[PDB]
Amino acid sequence: TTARNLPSGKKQRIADLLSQIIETLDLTKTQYANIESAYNGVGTFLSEGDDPLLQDAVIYPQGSVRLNTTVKPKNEEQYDIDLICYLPHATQADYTGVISAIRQRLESHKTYKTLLSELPRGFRINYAGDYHLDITPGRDHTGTAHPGQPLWVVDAQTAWKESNPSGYAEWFESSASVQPLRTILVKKLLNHIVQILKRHRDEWAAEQDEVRQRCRPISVIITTLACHAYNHIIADRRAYDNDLDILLDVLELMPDFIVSTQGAIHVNNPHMPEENFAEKWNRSEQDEGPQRSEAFYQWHAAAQATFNTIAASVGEDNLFLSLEDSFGKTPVDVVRQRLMEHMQSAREQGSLHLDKKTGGLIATAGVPKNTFYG
Amino acid sequence: VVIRHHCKPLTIAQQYRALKAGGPYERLRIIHHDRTLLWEGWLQPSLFSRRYKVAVRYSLGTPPICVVTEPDLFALAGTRAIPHLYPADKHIPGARLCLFLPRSQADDGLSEWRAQLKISDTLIPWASLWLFYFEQWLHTGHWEGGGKHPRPSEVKNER
């Protein structure tokens, strides 16, 4: 049994199950306010310094935090939050000046001094048990026009490389805003799709070996591929009512977006050209790069196969087993517990009706009080 | 419910018509010269759940019995003994299921199922709801439903 051939009701049930599973993976708004206040206080501390170079530092979110695609790490208590300082006065400032200016002051503050841990590409603050802050110093870039964010960041090899974070965020927000056409019957959706795919990749990578784990797909490549695929299916005006078929179609259209040019594979930022997210794929020291392009294709095949198996499920016991196998045991337990509580209340409320055709249970002829000896 | 006691068990005719309206039935018979009625069909608990064949018979003055003929409850449901694979009164080859509290335990004197209620109105939903917890047991390992069960010293059985 294939996923596409199923009736729309079963397929809607599958979509609801996946969405409810992902709902527990996301972080709440109270925590988000906590992180926001934390790095806002860090930036306010930074502004207070007498150091001229560090002055006018600005802190804004990036990555999974900016694009509203946070999925809680499996077996890890600490979330990952990444931030970048902006220095308008450091257009020509050196690495040493900015790094020392940040470091000595982070050591100066009573609260931040102990939690500070250095990183090769920046600085980190270790709030214990709940989340982290990741800081990367960067100078401004002039010469090329964009929505406004051409910027350099810090890497040991070249000390400055181009990156354009904000433009990607605006592009994703504009793209995910549009809703596909819906047939007439008698968090954005793209964000949920990317979150489901990231959860699937996270649980899939564990069973693989060391080489596949180290070469597993990264979040930004999958995000931009899914965004391009979603954009074309929006432009293609194709009617979409089959739920996980949207994942199947998007994941079908992702591998076509990988571009090979003169032996170099470029998956680019649509706004800023010169930075390849697939720059790891291109370089091939000891076949490290080629193995990375493989893992995406095996993940493509596995993700296409998993909904075939879940579609092949018969019985309510095997469906839960398949969802536990593909989407983690711990998220699945809560969904089943909530379903059982809901239908137990429906028994108590009296809203459990009988379907005329199949006699199936309806959870919303109220079933009278009954006792079942095991 | 405060009602007159003049109400008596209805004739077979009233529930003869009732079961026909709801769902498909392969057979519906009158046997033993208007004594017993038989019903068969297919019942599905959930949307992804299996397909179950159910047989029900009744006689005036006797409690109904419900038996799931096909399937065999998924090969007896992997040993254990709870899904009540029972002799089933020796005329239908299938597991006989308990659906209501017997009159003896009820102190008020009114059973959960009485002759006033029809067969399709309550007994069929009771069987479907029983099958739902039956299939859920295979995953959970515990009867996450009505947990009523006596011990052989404390047991009192009507069957």
Side-chain angles (χ1 to χ4, degrees):
Chain A
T1 303
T2 43
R4 280 181 212 271
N5 294 130
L6 287 172
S8 293
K10 301 170 81 76
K11 184 68 180 294
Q12 192 59 59
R13 165 71 172 170
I14 300 171
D16 299 336
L17 284 168
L18 272 77
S19 285
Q20 290 197 334
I21 278 171
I22 291 299
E23 294 293 328
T24 79
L25 276 296
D26 194 359
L27 59 85
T28 71
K29 65 178 72 66
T30 312
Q31 321 161 276
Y32 196 76
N34 193 2
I35 296 89
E36 175 178 326
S37 177
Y39 65 68
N40 275 330
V42 175
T44 301
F45 180 51
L46 285 173
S47 70
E48 290 180 359
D50 299 333
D51 208 318
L53 277 175
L54 188 153
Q55 190 167 32
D56 288 332
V58 176
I59 297 279
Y60 53 99
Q62 183 192 255
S64 302
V65 186
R66 179 58 139 92
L67 280 73
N68 196 358
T69 58
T70 54
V71 166
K72 63 94 175 178
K74 180 167 64 68
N75 302 327
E76 281 191 22
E77 295 178 354
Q78 314 215 39
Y79 298 73
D80 298 342
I81 317 296
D82 179 30
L83 278 297
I84 284 179
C85 294
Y86 175 53
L87 312 170
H89 298 288
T91 307
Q92 303 299 320
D94 285 334
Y95 199 92
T96 302
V98 178
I99 292 300
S100 69
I102 303 283
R103 196 217 287 196
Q104 308 177 304
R105 294 179 66 188
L106 279 179
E107 286 158 330
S108 296
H109 199 284
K110 179 260 184 181
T111 304
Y112 303 116
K113 64 189 288 182
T114 71
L115 316 163
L116 170 73
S117 68
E118 269 193 28
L119 292 180
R121 87 292 183 277
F123 292 164
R124 221 169 65 181
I125 289 173
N126 309 124
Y127 289 167
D130 53 356
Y131 61 91
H132 277 159
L133 293 177
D134 296 350
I135 305 178
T136 295
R139 75 180 177 90
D140 200 2
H141 186 199
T142 59
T144 177
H146 293 89
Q149 184 66 41
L151 178 140
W152 309 76
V153 308
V154 290
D155 49 355
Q157 297 86 69
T158 59
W160 307 101
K161 68 94 174 179
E162 304 90 346
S163 175
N164 181 11
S166 300
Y168 189 85
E170 280 182 351
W171 173 62
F172 195 94
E173 290 293 328
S174 60
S175 300
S177 299
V178 184
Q179 183 177 2
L181 308 156
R182 188 61 55 85
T183 316
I184 298 315
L185 268 296
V186 177
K187 296 178 287 296
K188 311 296 177 69
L189 172 65
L190 182 62
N191 285 77
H192 295 105
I193 305 305
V194 178
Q195 269 187 113
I196 297 169
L197 293 174
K198 279 173 68 178
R199 181 66 178 171
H200 193 281
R201 182 204 64 183
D202 286 337
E203 186 172 359
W204 168 86
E207 305 169 336
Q208 318 299 307
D209 54 49
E210 298 175 353
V211 166
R212 296 291 185 269
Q213 279 181 66
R214 189 168 53 249
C215 295
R216 66 170 176 249
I218 63 172
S219 302
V220 63
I221 288 178
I222 295 188
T223 314
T224 186
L225 290 176
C227 192
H228 278 325
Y230 192 70
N231 280 342
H232 291 171
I233 76 185
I234 286 176
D236 285 6
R237 298 174 182 88
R238 279 293 208 98
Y240 292 132
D241 54 1
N242 204 351
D243 291 331
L244 277 296
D245 282 31
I246 208 72
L247 283 74
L248 297 192
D249 201 3
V250 167
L251 166 77
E252 162 178 346
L253 293 170
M254 317 195 204
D256 270 354
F257 271 112
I258 291 173
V259 166
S260 194
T261 311
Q262 292 181 355
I265 287 169
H266 300 166
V267 194
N268 285 318
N269 188 359
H271 287 296
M272 187 66 204
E274 303 175 348
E275 83 275 19
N276 290 318
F277 300 128
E279 73 175 9
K280 300 288 182 66
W281 290 27
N282 286 312
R283 198 270 321 279
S284 62
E285 61 96 23
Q286 279 76 17
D287 291 331
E288 183 66 26
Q291 292 294 322
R292 304 178 174 282
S293 184
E294 273 205 41
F296 175 80
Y297 285 153
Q298 288 87 20
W299 187 74
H300 174 84
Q304 266 187 303
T306 54
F307 305 105
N308 289 333
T309 297
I310 306 166
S313 308
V314 65
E316 284 281 353
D317 50 8
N318 285 327
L319 181 151
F320 292 148
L321 180 61
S322 295
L323 263 69
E324 280 144 13
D325 190 4
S326 68
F327 296 141
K329 182 70 179 294
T330 299
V332 168
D333 312 308
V334 180
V335 183
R336 179 192 84 244
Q337 277 161 53
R338 292 183 291 113
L339 165 78
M340 294 299 291
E341 289 180 355
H342 185 195
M343 302 214 312
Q344 162 81 18
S345 67
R347 180 184 291 175
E348 288 173 351
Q349 291 296 323
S351 76
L352 213 64
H353 312 306
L354 184 74
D355 272 321
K356 295 297 291 181
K357 171 62 178 176
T358 67
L361 299 174
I362 311 165
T364 45
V367 189
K369 187 257 288 181
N370 51 359
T371 72
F372 299 158
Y373 161 58
Chain B
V1 180
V2 174
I3 58 169
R4 292 180 179 91
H5 70 279
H6 296 104
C7 292
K8 294 182 289 295
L10 300 176
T11 62
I12 191 165
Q14 288 82 17
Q15 69 275 17
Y16 182 76
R17 192 199 172 164
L19 281 76
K20 293 184 179 179
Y25 62 98
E26 277 84 13
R27 292 188 296 272
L28 190 151
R29 294 179 66 188
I30 294 171
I31 310 172
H32 295 285
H33 297 284
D34 302 348
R35 181 80 278 170
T36 307
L37 186 146
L38 272 295
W39 176 95
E40 286 182 354
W42 307 95
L43 272 159
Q44 201 174 359
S46 169
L47 188 59
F48 267 76
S49 64
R50 277 164 272 220
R51 179 66 65 192
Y52 293 107
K53 197 161 164 136
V54 177
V56 168
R57 69 172 288 166
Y58 181 76
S59 296
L60 302 177
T62 66
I65 65 158
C66 176
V67 168
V68 165
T69 67
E70 202 205 336
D72 206 3
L73 295 191
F74 181 63
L76 190 152
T79 186
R80 280 82 66 193
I82 64 168
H84 289 169
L85 185 60
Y86 279 161
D89 170 57
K90 277 74 69 178
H91 64 89
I92 290 172
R96 179 179 164 167
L97 297 181
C98 60
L99 275 72
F100 54 90
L101 190 65
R103 177 64 60 85
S104 45
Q105 287 69 240
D107 291 331
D108 45 23
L110 308 186
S111 296
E112 288 190 341
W113 189 93
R114 298 179 259 148
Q116 183 179 2
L117 307 162
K118 307 176 160 174
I119 289 192
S120 59
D121 62 0
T122 66
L123 189 153
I124 306 299
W126 285 349
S128 175
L129 182 58
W130 198 102
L131 290 160
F132 182 76
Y133 292 103
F134 158 68
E135 65 183 1
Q136 282 295 112
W137 181 65
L138 294 174
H139 196 43
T140 67
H142 304 293
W143 182 282
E144 60 184 2
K148 189 259 183 179
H149 58 283
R151 281 196 222 185
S153 71
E154 194 271 332
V155 70
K156 183 70 176 67
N157 288 321
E158 196 287 320
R159 174 179 167 180

